[PDB]
Amino acid sequence: EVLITGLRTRAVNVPLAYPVHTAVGTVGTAPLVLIDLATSAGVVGHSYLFAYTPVALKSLKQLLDDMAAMIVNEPLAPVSLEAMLAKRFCLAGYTGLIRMAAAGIDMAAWDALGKVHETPLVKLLGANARPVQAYDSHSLDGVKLATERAVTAAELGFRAVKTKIGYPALDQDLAVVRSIRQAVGDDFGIMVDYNQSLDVPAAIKRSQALQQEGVTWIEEPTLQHDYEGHQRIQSKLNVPVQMGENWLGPEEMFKALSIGACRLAMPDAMKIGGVTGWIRASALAQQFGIPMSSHLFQEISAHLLAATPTAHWLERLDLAGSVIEPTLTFEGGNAVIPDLPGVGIIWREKEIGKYLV
Template sequence: MDDLKITGLRTRAVNVPLQYTLKTAGGTIATVPLVLIDLLTDANVTGHAYVFTYTPLALKPIQSLIDELGAVVNGLPLAPFEIDRVLNARFRLLGHTGLVRIATAGIDMAAWDAKAKAHRLPLVELLGGKARPIPAYDSHGMDDVELGTKRARDALEAGFKAIKTKAGYATLERDLEVIRAIKQVTGDSVELMIDYNQGLSVPEARRRGRALEAEGIAWIEEPTLQHDYAGHASIREALRIPVQIGENWFGPEDMQKAIDAQACDLCMPDVMKIGGVTGWLKASALAEQHGMPMSSHIFQEFSAHLLAVTPTAHYLERMDLAGPILDPVLRFKDGNALVGDEPGAGIRWREEEVSRFLV
């Protein structure tokens, strides 16, 4: 079982619909462009993963890059840490970030999925952990009052005890109006997180953050440009609300820079951008070392397994981007994510639906 080798790689590009258009202070996402990855092995076990390209413009470049990397990993042992070493070395001169990191992370996730399936174990058990309920929050867009309150009611009825909504309207007064309307629905028993998606200047983030302190907000996320760690540190120093960042860290090295700058109270790596399962494990060690609560960003299927082996696990983000093309293996009950006992990470393509949304 430990001498398995990779024998091939297949990719498909799809663009799937969203139930609700995802409006943010940084732009609007109307559809979900994904590259689906099937990693083949000589044991007739196939690993599945997907990467999210944010814009359809990046679909074909990322798909092409993953296809090219198929030749690099073909014949390698199904050993994710060794694959990570090989790919890191390959891109040392070019730089292992951006689209390159997305492509290699997709292969890493598929390799871990295949390895767990080969051992007939859920990914969490292959990683040495045990499946357990993971607290989850329902993640919403910049929905304004009517839709924002409707989605809050739906989340409460579904059992969620935490909700995130996006803000960054034209005025602070509008932010407060929307947030207070949602709080009227949720009451004080539900945690409410606010995500600004990098939409504010540092002075404006401090101003709006101070106004939010009286609203009982659980965290304020990416209030200013994600790479401005000094700016985030000054916002953090000015506010009593915890500052959350991390979804745009490309690799654990970015996370270390943010920690060194004291830019955040909380962290939420994105399993794709941080470097796949292997990158997540490195980030988890950093979070433990610094006592930093660690949440996930999208990719809920893999994230539920990874948070179960994360010592400082905080929240899973429930945002079902790939739902239209996946069988619903991951379940949510009483505000928790439940992975079940299926081997791998729980990625099963609904092939008929995949065919509908092929690009």
């Protein structure tokens, strides 16, 4: 009875507030697919996807455009829609770019369901809005820029930052972390993320040195699919190993928590399967006793974390700020959900045409 009536997608390369420094060089834009899901109720659901690299951007938009005929005239009902897409893609493989596209439809379908009921998503999920602690996420920035970014975050009221590390020598990782720590003081979180760059023995050596410095967690020290190698690294540490941004569906989270790969989790709202996948992931993190943070997608993640019994941190990294209104607020380093139906995503229509592919 409310039916989906259309899917529209727009591929954009948007400027990043913080250019991303990598081992190769700097990237100053993010490739996104913005999604509009029309309904027979006259409301339009909005979401977006991150394509990671511009090599995948046109392919992800073309995949979504060719999935429109599977969803148009189906009832909006995201949990039912997700089961239908999981079955339709069971041969192709309901993972990678297909699962990401399905998650973008789910996150749009939940934003429209909240609009049909004139209620923020957090309340539709049965919870009250609450401010959630956030950390500001930076990149592989070198000692001077990482310290300047940490000092700007601290001046903006965040009480933790994340820096990416994995320089050619462990001394340079430690020089970054120590310089930040001098600038922000001891009563401040410094998360660190090796973005899959170490083998297991290097990750044990480097992480035991970083745990002596005092860091908040150590994120993806090794290849993201190697859950046993993450469990061997965590078995040598007191500081917690954090992972999860690369789990494609809750069935990958379940496999990593069943072997004890990590003592923290941080699903990505797109890769875990949207709101439907995150609800499932929340139930698993509750039973396995794992505090659960978010990865990217801050606008929907502030709602999802408020319904997550083990919620821990929200990652602030504003990928779509150039094309979405700043309805999400940070107040004393906590994200505060807007009082708007659905997710609170409202497009900057005059900006989007600047960045179309």
